[PDB]
Symmetry: none
Subunit: 569 residues, 2 copies
């Protein structure tokens, strides 16, 4: 139910127009060819508004276009071309509802990756940074107007921005084994992209034995799944989980009966058997299926906090390309990615994301009178009325409800733990108590600014809203069409250098610490220990500071829910 | 002889690593137990890249481990066992020089067979296919990283792959009857395994009354030998000879004196005496015997084109287990196997195999000045300088030297005929003049691809070479670690379907034709009849066509050497 001011839409439209002109003025007459395993690609040198330069390769295919017969199926190897492929322009994004215009946009032909570097023949093979975009497995792209590499190319890395399939086209799951639609096609897209990166990044000056995958939100859950699944074993070497992981409630779902339901909304007209539902969905118009996803969830599922109709899932039977054979919790216990350096973190006010949704639908704070809807499904009964479940809601009410009446602030603070802090805590402990995993570095993004923004602020109508929301940190990692040239001495600019500098440092060494990052002199950044009772993290504000996590107290309160059921923690 | 580059060896090494984890990814949690006359055996359900499943039993002993006193001796019945024997992994290959790493690997403990089928409980008693691997009788195995059943298990058949003893450990031959080392130990393993199969294939859903033995190259000569020996009279019902047969000149050898020569290279010591030479080789380290067998052949012998020092031999005295009491061509006249449906074939450029050898040894092409060294030993004088043999060599030369000076390509053309096509001619004709044996169906594999390969291409440094070498057809019968999933529409996948379908068709009925097979509409595939002056063959490339053998003209030029010796032909 995300709505955007009609003026903001006009203002966004004029920005799209203006961004086309800027993009041209930063394009150079310098093109260049790189080799790949499937053939030659042609890129272009581009400039930044800071007058840095980099080589851009966009729309490199890592898989066959998943159309016709390939709809809902695992991606297959792309086919080699002779000659030279023009990669001087972006290709289209995955079919999705545009988060601003509310229109359906994109294309089924979306399996592409983009490669950026400041030097195509460096004296050393560079760290490779792979970004998986977020958007709830329902939106997002690798377009430079949302995820410009302009900041990262100040640093000596190869940066790669991937696409993957989204929504029902990415994540439709059917139980029938005859059909070859187990689910997670968009996740298997990512695996194949990652595989391409390992086999080809050297051709762009990157070190295949030094690959970092990071992502934010659904991109972080994606990164984690890429660290869990046996498909990607040993393929990368560092992982960064930005505001998300694979055991977040929103990060997965058993969507196997939602396909008959999607077919129905599209004009089916047949029986609830997987075979005929797939037959019909295989003829449906892509844009129409995507249009109707928002109505697939029943009020009961929405009330039980199911976020999306289609997403990552436990696959109902084994296949060769199976990415998620068991529950994420179970896969953690056996995860190869436990063995690699890991950095995690969240913004300092994640739930602030829901500010204008609560304005649209104010009858939501009443869900805090009893916090029954936010009790983890493991503990909550079917009807969610049993005294054990009320007793536990009460534990959450105590942690978040500030007065005698629950408010907007309480709800948004509760969401920060429900969607982010608590799952990350659980992952940290489960990681210690069932695996020998390499300790994790924690950060906390707490830098607020209204002077430089990204387009997610528009989507949630968060302009002028003070506080550091889910999504706010991407502004200091990526150029976007709403960004601007900042004075070299300003607050926002130094955060860019810090964030990009810390991620680069972590991608290089496995340790985010550097004394060459201004503000980070005198910082003692320790990884989290099994023994630790309170986590310590680098709080990223105007100054960099090692505080212990302020959310700890409340995280401990959420943990008490599991007092009697200590094995499900 | 065959050398592999460091670059290719490194790539092979990492391919082995990757294959191991792909093997785990392709492994189900489904195990099954089957009966044997020796005890119960545990197997596993395994997936395929195309997402087919099959039940896999590896490491079923059909004989006693030929160690200690059993070395060089005929194989002995295995010992029965109580409970469930585990057959979820491959056993060792026969002691061997690795055809890529150049290092000795494998073990004396190698008398095992594997059994694969998509169904333990089929509706019919299925055709049983029994593949005998090639490798000149010195290399080879039944591991699925070289001979993967993944393609055949698409068909409703039982597929079985045997191991047998290689090199000196399987083919030592000594004249003295007291010592009981007559020769053909490895072929005796083959008899043993076949008997196990007759007696046990019904336990896996096979038809004891419908068994096909097929082998490529030395496995083809092995297959022929099994069709020739009284030891196996009755056991099986079809035979397919792929690039070779028992009257090929590399396919047998009188190796009796060479046990001394090997024993000498290894340290011995005493006199040219079958008793003492044997005592030494018995105490000797198996890996030392195999490493040195490369040095056993004199210059004399390999000039005369003796290719292997140890191999199938005419046994000097009769034993209960004797496989070969006479010369192969005399055994053809008596062979039980002449009455069973037979398929024979060759590739369209078998000699292209020696390509790297000629690059390594350009001096080799000088043997084509006279061609004296390629003259059938039947026809040639000892030192190969007599007027009559210069004239016979002159007839070989006219057939193959295209220009005026002999090139590498004339050498390879010649090799196609000397090793394969001519012996095949001679076999068909021998079966006509001296037997009322069955009309043989002939095929020609003529499909070239660089998109899908097998390890032998690595071995023969054939990565870049255009044309269809000896060994190239196996890529379309067996999965291997260098293989990948192909698209259903691709020219390679379609070949796999055809090859596998034709083999399965011929295994079922004894006629290789079916209109079920995609490229086999409008093909009248008749077998070769006594009256045919020009052979007719199914040619397999992108299309499937009945033609006359393109090599027929040169075959008849080879035959003209016997003009004055019609009796020896």
């Amino acid at each position: 139910n995300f709505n955007v001011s009609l003026m903001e839409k006009l203002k966004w439209k004029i920005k799209c127009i203006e961004n086309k002109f800027l993009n041209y003025r930063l394009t150079t007459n310098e093109t260049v060819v790189a080799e790949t395993e499937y053939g030659k690609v042609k890129g272009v040198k581009r400039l930044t508004v800071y007058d840095d330069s980099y080589y851009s390769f966009e729309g490199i295919p890592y898989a066959q276009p998943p159309v016709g017969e390939l709809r809902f199926k695992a991606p297959q190897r792309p086919t080699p071309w002779a000659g030279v492929r023009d990669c001087c322009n972006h290709k289209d994004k995955s079919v999705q509802v545009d988060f601003i215009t509310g229109k359906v946009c994109g294309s089924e032909d979306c399996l592409y990756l983009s490669v950026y570097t400041n030097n195509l023949n460096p004296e050393t093979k560079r760290p490779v940074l792979v970004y998986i975009h977020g958007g709830g497995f329902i939106i997002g792209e690798n377009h430079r107007d949302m995820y410009g590499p302009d900041y990262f190319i100040k640093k000596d890395v190869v940066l790669i921005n991937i696409q993957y399939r989204l929504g029902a086209l990415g994540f439709l799951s059917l139980n029938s084994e005859d059909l070859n639609v187990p689910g997670n096609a968009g996740l298997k897209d990512q695996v194949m992209a990652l595989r391409w990166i390992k086999n080809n990044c050297a051709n762009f000056g990157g070190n295949p034995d030094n690959i970092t995958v990071f992502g934010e939100s659904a991109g972080a859950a994606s990164t984690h799944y890429m660290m869990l699944t046996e498909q990607t074993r040993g393929l990368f070497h560092r992982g960064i989980l930005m505001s998300g992981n694979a055991i977040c409630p929103w990060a997965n779902t058993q969507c196997q009966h939602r396909a008959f339901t999607l077919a129905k909304l599209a004009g089916y007209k047949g029986e609830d058997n997987d075979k005929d539902v797939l037959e019909f969905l295989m003829k449906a118009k892509p844009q129409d299926l995507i249009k109707l996803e928002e109505k697939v969830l029943t009020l009961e599922e929405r009330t039980n906090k199911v976020m999306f109709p289609f997403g990552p899932t436990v696959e109902p039977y084994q296949t060769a390309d199976c990415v998620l054979p068991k529950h994420p919790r179970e896969m953690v216990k056996t995860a190869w990615g436990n063995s690699i350096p890991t950095m995690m973190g969240n913004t300092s006010y994640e739930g602030l994301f829901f500010t204008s949704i609560l304005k649209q639908m104010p009858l939501l704070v009443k869900e805090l009178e009893t916090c029954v809807n936010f009790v983890p499904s493991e503990l909550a009964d079917a009807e969610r009325t049993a005294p054990e479940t009320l007793e536990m809601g009460a534990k959450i009410k105590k942690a978040h409800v500030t007065g005698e009446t629950p408010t907007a602030d309480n709800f948004m603070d509760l969401c920060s733990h429900f969607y982010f802090w608590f799952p990350m805590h659980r992952l940290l402990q489960l990681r210690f108590n069932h695996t020998s995993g390499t300790p994790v570095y924690l950060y906390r993004f707490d830098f607020d600014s209204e002077d430089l923004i990204n387009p997610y602020r528009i989507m949630r109508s968060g302009r002028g809203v003070k506080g550091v929301s889910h999504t706010d940190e991407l502004t200091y990692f990526f150029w976007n069409q709403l960004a601007k040239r900042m004075p070299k001495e300003s607050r926002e600019y130094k955060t860019i250098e810090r964030m990009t500098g810390i991620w680069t440092q972590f991608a290089t060494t496995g340790n985010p610490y550097s004394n060459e990052i201004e503000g980070m002199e005198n910082v003692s950044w320790d990884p989290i220990e099994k023994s630790d009772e309170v986590y310590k993290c680098l709080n990223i504000s105007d100054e960099l500071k090692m505080i212990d996590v302020p959310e700890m107290g409340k995280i401990k309160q959420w943990e008490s829910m599991f007092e009697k059921h200590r094995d499900l923690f």
